[PDB]
Design a protein around this nucleic acid. Structure first.
Ligand SMILES: [Mg+2]
Ligand SMILES: [Mg+2]
Ligand SMILES: [Mg+2]
Ligand SMILES: [Mg+2]
Ligand SMILES: [Mg+2]
Ligand SMILES: [Mg+2]
Ligand SMILES: [Mg+2]
Ligand SMILES: [Mg+2]
Ligand SMILES: [Mg+2]
Ligand SMILES: [Mg+2]
Ligand SMILES: [Mg+2]
Ligand SMILES: [Mg+2]
Ligand SMILES: [Mg+2]
Ligand SMILES: [Mg+2]
Ligand SMILES: [Mg+2]
Ligand SMILES: [Mg+2]
Ligand SMILES: [Mg+2]
Ligand SMILES: [Mg+2]
Ligand SMILES: [Mg+2]
Ligand SMILES: [Mg+2]
Ligand SMILES: [Mg+2]
Ligand SMILES: [Mg+2]
Ligand SMILES: [Mg+2]
Ligand SMILES: [Mg+2]
Ligand SMILES: [Mg+2]
Ligand SMILES: [Mg+2]
Ligand SMILES: [Mg+2]
Ligand SMILES: [Mg+2]
Ligand SMILES: [Mg+2]
Ligand SMILES: [Mg+2]
Ligand SMILES: [Mg+2]
Ligand SMILES: [Mg+2]
Ligand SMILES: [Mg+2]
Ligand SMILES: [Mg+2]
Ligand SMILES: [Mg+2]
Ligand SMILES: [Mg+2]
Ligand SMILES: [Mg+2]
Ligand SMILES: [Mg+2]
Ligand SMILES: [Mg+2]
Ligand SMILES: [Mg+2]
Ligand SMILES: [Mg+2]
Ligand SMILES: [Mg+2]
Ligand SMILES: [Mg+2]
Lengths: 51, 187, 52, 103, 147, 68
RNA sequence: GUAAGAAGCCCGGCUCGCUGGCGUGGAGCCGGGGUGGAAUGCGAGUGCCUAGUGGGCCACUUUUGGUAAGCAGAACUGGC
RNA sequence: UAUAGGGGCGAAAGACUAAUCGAACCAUCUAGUAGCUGGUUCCCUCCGAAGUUUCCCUCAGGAUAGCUGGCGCUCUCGCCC
RNA sequence: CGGCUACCCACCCGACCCGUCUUGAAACACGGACCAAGGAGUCUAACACGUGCGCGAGUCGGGGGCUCGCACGAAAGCCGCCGUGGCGCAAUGAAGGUGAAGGCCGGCGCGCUCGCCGGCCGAGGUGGGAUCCCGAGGCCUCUCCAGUCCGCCGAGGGGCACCACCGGCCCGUCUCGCCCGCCGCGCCGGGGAGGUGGAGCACGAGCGCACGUGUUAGGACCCGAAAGAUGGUGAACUAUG
RNA sequence: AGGCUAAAUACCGGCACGAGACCGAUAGUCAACAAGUACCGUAAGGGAAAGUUGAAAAGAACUUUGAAGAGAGAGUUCAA
């Protein structure tokens, strides 16, 4: 009952601007967005409240 | 009395090899004969390195054994190592160079035979070079041992950079007094 | 069950024959070979004992 | 009591450990017992296979082992209903059934 | 082996390797780490700096399970897949590149070292470093994030 | 229970049991402890020595090999 | 305590974000030249591990307190 | 017959409580700990101390440095310098 | 006839009774009447160092499983899509986290205390450094001539390990300033130049077993107390009803 | 805030059981034996010492001194 599945995906050509788009900064941007997801919502609520 | 000096009878030396390896004793016999009968200081140093222990013969690495032959003047010379030459995961290309060492590992022998070189032993090296002509004697990274990084004048008094013994390298284990200025003194 | 130095052991998983330290280990043949005796100093068998 | 440069040691031997020393002198004995237990099961019980009930493909809950795979416990009653068989009828067929496993 | 023991050699000597004057009886200095601040300060200090005091925050119910991220280097990045694979995939055929997945090998984060040859590959990992990402961009490979 | 307080007797002999040592070997003396303004001089001077010394020293070596 | 040389002496040239009348000064780097540089004796440097020791005493000389001590306390050297 | 162990009893001596009482007897924890006495078992060879610095509720003790032994490693000589 | 000797005696000389506390023992210091047997540094766990062996960026089956029932078999052999796991291959931070490659050449922006494009090399430099390499030179019974022959070296070069210094990279803090990207243009991220703290990197040397030394905790080299606690037994002596 | 349930696990008591790089009558359990026995303390409780003739008693018929213990002859046994 193990059945360690072996997905291979051997042959593919190097592709378009995904290799320019998937840099290291996406992880830091996602980390900062996850850390500051709530405080931006609170500031948007305060900006909608104070008119 | 005669000797007003101190009595230091034996200097430091190890005369006979402490290992009970029969093959190492036969190589000790052969290179002792060559060292006392060929006037070859190469055979002198190789016989001393066979007298040398298991620990003080560190394992050579394949990248270092490539780079010490990549220097100009080492094209057709043979890299003689008293010790083991091991595989390196870092390398990508292996030249057509010759190896003369004891107990080369399996992956290293496989990659050298795929690259096209020639591995030998010390008896074949003696049959090819009695005086040791055309050889370069190599040694390995002794000071990079984990044991030698604990060794110094102190662990931390002029900060000393010499690795105090502890169980777990991290928080709560030897990081408070003498390791920072906010909690007591600082080294 | 053990194999030669060319192939691995087929019955065992990850075993090979060990490294052989001295391949042609005839020490008398080596020390009486012409390549070794070509590079010898001289047979020095004088004793040179104590002179009174 | 301490000495030259060696690691600070705190062994947990201040408690009277000499009474409770469990040393595995009966480890080949338990091995022979458990061999005979498995053989007596395979003889006397059934022509059912050893490790009788079938175990599921199960992913391990971690950020560490969830890339790997595991034989679970039971077949997760919604899965068993989609397969279309009764619960204890499946248990007598040989299907291992766990009512807790969700999907 | 009691025949190789120093006790067998020291039979005949009166004080048995511990002196007549000092008289090592039971426990002259204490027991264990006794006197860590009072009278053994030159051995707890000057051989174990940092042994006394609190250092930082206290994470209640910590596991060595959530911080599981074994790091792979760019030196180790090639031998996770066999050499036959990269040779037969980069033997002058086309611009195709093999995928080296470190998650199947068991490593999560790719870190940056040297020795990264001209032949580009596609590396899939859950985490990266900016140096390794720049090395992959310099050799021409592609960066792919997985989860 | 009065004991002997302090002495330096039998001390120079223990000093000369092992032959009191000069440090005796410092080639290319250590550099820490020197003026930080002087270090801001010297490190920038060394790295621009590493950068911009090629052509003038090469032509000077050619000129002195031609003249000597 | 220091110096009695090849780790030293001199010449030529680069760099400096230090300094600044000045290509001024100072440091670093590069190339070249000649080793016979006080006496005597000795083959040296360095790394690891560790026992015992942590009660001392006497003598020439210089000395502290005491009237003095085989008294108490110091310095060099030697001895137990 | 009643009072049984930090309990009894005492015209009071801290006396008596099974030859033991200013805290009974037997067993267990317990082989309690001791920086404190005494002892520590065959031969030969080589090397070979100290009673000193500093710290400690430290002064009959310990830690550290010094003195010492063992294990080596790096080199150097044997052929006018 | 010769004979040293675990036989006895005599003579000349020297010679206080051993063991240990001590600066000092034959001591008017302590133990020892004599003899036979027993009698004191062991074992486990952990660490450190040294040595020996196997494999070696890997290593290790101690946890289980497989063999036909075997006295030695409570052994041994094997697993490998049983490597789960321990140690090592990455460190620094209290933490969020971050995480070790640079150098050369040509062109471009004011080669501007300044970035980009294309190609090449690749774990940096200096001073020592066993060894190794090239080699002027001269040496062998009569001449021009040669090849191995007898036969070393002035000088030069690449430089193992390691030492000393300089330089570089990574992590957390400090100072100064500018630039870049947008799964969304924000108290968002990233990058540069300097001096610091690290048990770091700067081609890795570990893992397992065994032996030796030292330390710790366990009764821990052997014997030794005044004492504390727990549970029971005694008013047949004596004290008082 | 109601309940049951075999397996893997533990066992120095007990009934048989097999093995031992263990010990050898001052050792090994206190105890190889009429051993928790003799004995001690009012009691709780404490607690020993102690193996070996020979192949088989064939354990010395008979004579003799002494009242016997014992002894000299004689005999059994490879050996008194
Ligand atoms: Mg003499
Ligand atoms: Mg001596
Ligand atoms: Mg000690
Ligand atoms: Mg206890
Ligand atoms: Mg001694
Ligand atoms: Mg002591
Ligand atoms: Mg003193
Ligand atoms: Mg000792
Ligand atoms: Mg003392
Ligand atoms: Mg005095
Ligand atoms: Mg006195
Ligand atoms: Mg004397
Ligand atoms: Mg009570
Ligand atoms: Mg009480
Ligand atoms: Mg009484
Ligand atoms: Mg009292
Ligand atoms: Mg009491
Ligand atoms: Mg004891
Ligand atoms: Mg003191
Ligand atoms: Mg010490
Ligand atoms: Mg020493
Ligand atoms: Mg020594
Ligand atoms: Mg004493
Ligand atoms: Mg005295
Ligand atoms: Mg004496
Ligand atoms: Mg007396
Ligand atoms: Mg006496
Ligand atoms: Mg006496
Ligand atoms: Mg005896
Ligand atoms: Mg070791
Ligand atoms: Mg794993
Ligand atoms: Mg661990
Ligand atoms: Mg006691
Ligand atoms: Mg108390
Ligand atoms: Mg009465
Ligand atoms: Mg009365
Ligand atoms: Mg319930
Ligand atoms: Mg229940
Ligand atoms: Mg059960
Ligand atoms: Mg007996
Ligand atoms: Mg008995
Ligand atoms: Mg019988
Ligand atoms: Mg006989």
């Amino acid at each position: 009952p193990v059945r360690n599945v072996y997905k291979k995906e051997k042959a593919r050509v190097i592709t378009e601007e995904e290799k320019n788009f998937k840099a290291f900064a996406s992880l830091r941007m996602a980390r900062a967005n996850a850390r500051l997801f709530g405080i931006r919502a609170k500031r948007a609520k305060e900006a909608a409240e104070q008119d | 009395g005669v000797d007003i000096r101190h009595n230091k009878d034996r200097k430091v030396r190890r005369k006979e090899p402490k290992s009970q390896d029969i093959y190492l004793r036969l190589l000790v016999k052969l290179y002792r004969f060559l060292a006392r009968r060929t006037n070859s200081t190469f055979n002198q140093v190789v016989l001393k390195r066979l007298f040398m222990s298991r620990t003080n013969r560190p394992p050579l690495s394949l990248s270092r054994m490539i780079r010490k032959m990549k220097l100009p003047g080492r094209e057709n010379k043979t890299a003689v190592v008293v010790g083991t030459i091991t595989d390196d995961v870092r390398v990508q290309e292996v030249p057509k160079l010759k190896v003369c060492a004891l107990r080369v590992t399996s992956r290293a022998r496989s990659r050298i035979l795929r690259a096209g070189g020639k591995i030998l032993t010390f008896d074949q090296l003696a049959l090819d070079s009695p005086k040791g002509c055309g050889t370069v004697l190599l040694s390995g990274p002794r000071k990079g041992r984990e044991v030698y990084r604990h060794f110094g004048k102190a662990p931390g008094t002029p900060h000393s950079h010499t690795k105090p013994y502890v169980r777990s390298k991290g928080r709560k284990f030897e990081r408070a007094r003498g390791r920072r200025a906010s909690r007591g003194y600082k080294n | 069950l053990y194999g030669t130095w060319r192939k691995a052991a087929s019955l065992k998983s990850n075993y090979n024959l060990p490294m052989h330290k001295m391949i042609n280990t005839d020490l008398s043949r080596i020390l009486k070979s012409p390549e070794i005796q070509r590079a010898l100093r001289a047979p020095r068998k004088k004793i040179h004992r104590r002179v009174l | 009591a301490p000495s030259r440069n060696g690691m600070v040691l705190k062994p947990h031997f201040h408690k009277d450990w000499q009474r409770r020393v469990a040393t595995w002198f009966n480890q080949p004995a338990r091995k022979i017992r458990r061999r005979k237990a498995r053989q007596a099961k395979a003889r006397r019980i059934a022509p059912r296979p050893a490790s009788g009930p079938i175990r599921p493909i199960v992913r391990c809950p971690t950020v560490r082992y969830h890339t790997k795979v595991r034989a679970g416990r039971g077949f997760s009653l919604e899965e068993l209903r989609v397969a279309g068989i009764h619960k204890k009828v499946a248990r007598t067929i040989g299907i291992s059934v766990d009512p807790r496993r969700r999907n | 082996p009691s025949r190789l023991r120093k006790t067998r050699k020291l039979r005949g000597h009166v004080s048995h390797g511990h002196g007549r004057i000092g008289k090592h009886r039971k426990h002259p200095g204490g027991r264990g780490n006794a006197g860590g601040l009072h009278h053994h300060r030159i051995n707890f200090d000057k051989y174990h700096p940092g042994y006394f005091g609190k250092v930082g925050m206290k994470h209640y119910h910590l596991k060595r399970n959530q911080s599981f991220c074994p790091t792979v280097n760019l030196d180790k990045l090639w031998t996770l897949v066999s050499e036959q694979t990269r040779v037969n995939a980069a033997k002058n055929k086309t611009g195709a590149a093999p995928i080296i997945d470190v998650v199947r090998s068991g490593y999560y984060k790719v870190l940056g070292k040297g020795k990264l040859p001209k032949q580009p590959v596609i590396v899939k990992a859950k985490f990266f470093s900016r140096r390794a990402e720049e090395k992959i961009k310099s050799v021409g490979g592609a960066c792919v994030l997985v989860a | 229970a009065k004991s002997k307080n302090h002495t330096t007797h039998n001390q120079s002999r223990k000093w000369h049991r092992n032959g009191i040592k000069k440090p005796r070997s410092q080639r290319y003396e250590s550099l820490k402890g020197v003026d930080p303004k002087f270090l801001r001089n010297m490190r920038f001077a060394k790295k621009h020595n590493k950068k911009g010394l090629k052509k003038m020293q090469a032509n000077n070596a050619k000129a002195m090999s031609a003249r000597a």
